């Protein structure tokens, strides 16, 4: 004999209470400017905290965090469609357009002291070559990728890294155990390029296994599965991805191979074949052709059904657009002279390398009202508390009282000290991180056909 185990209060789809109107609005940013060094930041020598020239390349994530003006602070000419005593107003997204205007062409990087031992494609004879230091200069193309994310919560990532060891055991080899983590994706941090989603800063002592841009960083990677499985669904509205790579060359490492390959698999040789070379091999991704029809931008994106339960409604008046491109990541060179003379010499010039990058944000929104009633206000309150606060209509006693007295003291800390805990709301949890911010509080409009999107929006909507 058994039983239906436990009734649990479920989450519900957001189209149950959110009501839509026939009022639309436009927003649009200006052209964004970004320029810097493709390899590393330029730090000031005297004070080593302020930057001189920042590091930016193609393979850094460009997370965007726009701001939205609160719709309740709008004096409308005809306030008859809603009551501000019983309702409130909040925005929802319906459109998306990301523009890039740089010409195509992939960027490249490298590393001057890369741990190449020998080429392992057609000829590696015996015996071993002499030397204690055999690092070489190599330059290397990257794999290509295209993606896009939108949502109300900033996107949550995941990466490998050094974690906890185990108990003192003499049977487990000196190998750092690998552990999964969950992180919030910052700006500037990198994407995988076929070398695993692990931190290279705390796992590679030699710093000679990747190109120079990704030795001391965490090449994070976006999670789909954990993010799709969030019950509230306020992180992923709508997303695409497209990537490709293939092998170009083959290489081996160099050094004391940490595990001897077992004798059960091979017959050992002699003469010139007494010693054994390495087994630590690694490829190089290069990337392939990039068409104009393999692009995922300069295209409208109409949304009518998100995969999560949030149907585009954005609490807190903020969005989160993250984009990764490599197709316009080309690298220009600069050549300035020191002296002018009529004969070429290799020390009269100086070289700097740079990289440019620009973006375009283009949006259309819809106005939505919430008829706040007693059975509904409890439903948001178990989801969040900040949205109920900044609407400025009420406050909450968090219990209905406690059940234990808990024995509060009164004589102020002179006999048996405890955790005093001076509190602070800290006004957001997101303030520790750093995003490319772009304001839009003076960039709304109601007349559509003076902008490219609303001209296209009127055709697909049939209005």
């Amino acid at each position: 004999v058994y039983l239906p185990p436990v009734p649990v209060s479920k989450v519900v789809s957001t189209d149950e209470y959110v009501s839509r109107t026939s009022i639309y609005y436009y927003a649009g940013s200006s052209r964004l400017l970004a320029v810097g060094n493709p390899y590393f930041s330029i730090k000031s020598p005297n004070n080593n905290k302020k930057v001189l020239v920042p590091k930016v390349s193609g393979l850094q994530y460009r997370v965007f965090r726009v701001r939205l003006p609160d719709p309740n602070k709008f004096g409308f000419p005809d306030t008859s469609f809603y009551n501000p005593d019983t309702q409130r107003l909040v925005w929802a997204c319906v459109g998306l357009e990301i523009g890039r205007g740089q010409p195509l062409g992939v960027g490249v990087s490298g590393h001057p002291y890369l741990n190449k031992f020998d080429d392992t494609e057609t000829s590696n004879r015996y015996p071993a070559q002499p030397g204690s230091d055999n690092r070489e200069c190599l330059s290397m193309d990257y794999k290509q990728t295209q993606l896009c994310l939108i949502g109300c919560k900033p996107p949550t990532g995941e990466h490998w890294g050094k974690g906890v060891a185990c108990n003192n055991n003499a049977a487990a080899t000196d190998c750092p155990p690998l552990e999964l983590f969950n992180s919030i994706i910052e700006d500037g941090d990198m994407v995988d390029t076929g070398f695993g989603c692990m931190d290279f800063g705390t796992l590679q002592a030699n710093k000679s296994d990747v190109p120079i841009d990704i030795c001391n960083s965490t090449c994070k990677y976006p999670d789909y599965l954990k993010m799709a499985s969030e019950p509230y669904g306020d992180s992923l509205f709508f997303f695409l991805r497209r990537e490709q790579m293939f092998v170009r060359h083959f290489f081996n490492r160099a050094g004391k191979l940490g595990e001897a390959v077992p004798d059960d698999l091979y017959i050992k040789g002699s003469g010139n074949t007494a010693v054994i070379q390495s087994s630590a091999f690694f490829p190089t991704p290069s990337g392939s052709i990039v068409t104009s029809e393999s692009q995922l931008f300069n295209k409208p994106y109409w949304l009518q059904r998100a995969q999560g339960h949030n149907n585009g409604i954005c609490w807190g008046n903020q969005l989160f657009v993250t984009v990764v491109d490599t197709t316009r990541s080309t690298n220009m060179t600069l050549c300035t002279e020191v002296t002018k003379e009529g004969t070429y010499k290799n020390d009269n010039f100086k070289e700097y390398v740079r990289h440019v990058e620009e973006y375009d944000l283009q949006f259309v929104f819809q106005l939505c009202k919430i008829t706040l009633t007693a059975e509904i206000m409890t439903y948001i309150h178990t989801m969040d508390s900040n949205i109920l606060e900044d609407w400025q209509f009420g406050l909450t006693p968090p219990p209905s009282a406690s059940l234990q007295d808990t024995y509060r003291f009164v004589t102020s800390q002179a006999i048996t000290c405890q955790k005093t805990a001076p509190p602070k709301e800290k006004e957001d949890p997101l303030n520790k991180y750093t995003f490319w911010e772009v304001n839009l509080k003076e960039k709304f409009s109601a007349d559509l056909d003076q902008f490219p999107l609303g001209r296209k929006f009127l055709l697909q909507s049939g209005l």
């Binding site: 003192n168 003499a170 049977a171 487990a172 000196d174 001897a260 077992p262």
Partner: protein
């Protein structure tokens, strides 16, 4: 095939260093499959495990002591050496060095 003999100082004084040397012939310790321990016994009491060191250079000790007992091998001469510092009156015993398996998980 496997032959085994030990060699030690024999007579020690309190608070001195103990260098018990173990010697083997018949195998190599860097081979994947060979492994050795170190076991004591007094004349009257029973037996107890002290230290055991494996192929890939990691060490375990008896956690009651955990400080003085430092085991180390020399795979080039194919020997193990036992290094106890500050030998006290409780260490009056007869030590036994030998080879272990893990398919038998005991001392052969």
């Amino acid at each position: 095939q496997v032959t085994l003999k030990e060699s030690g100082p024999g007579i020690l004084q309190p608070s001195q260093t103990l260098s018990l040397t173990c010697s083997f012939s018949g195998f190599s310790l860097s081979t994947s499959g060979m492994g050795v321990g170190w076991i004591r016994q007094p004349s009257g009491k029973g037996l107890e495990w002290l230290a055991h060191i494996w192929w890939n250079d990691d060490k375990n000790y008896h956690p009651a002591l955990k400080s003085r007992l430092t085991i180390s091998k020399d795979t080039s001469s194919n020997r193990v050496f036992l290094n106890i510092a500050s030998v006290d009156t409780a260490d009056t015993a007869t030590y036994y060095c030998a080879r272990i398996h893990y398919v038998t998980d005991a001392l052969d």
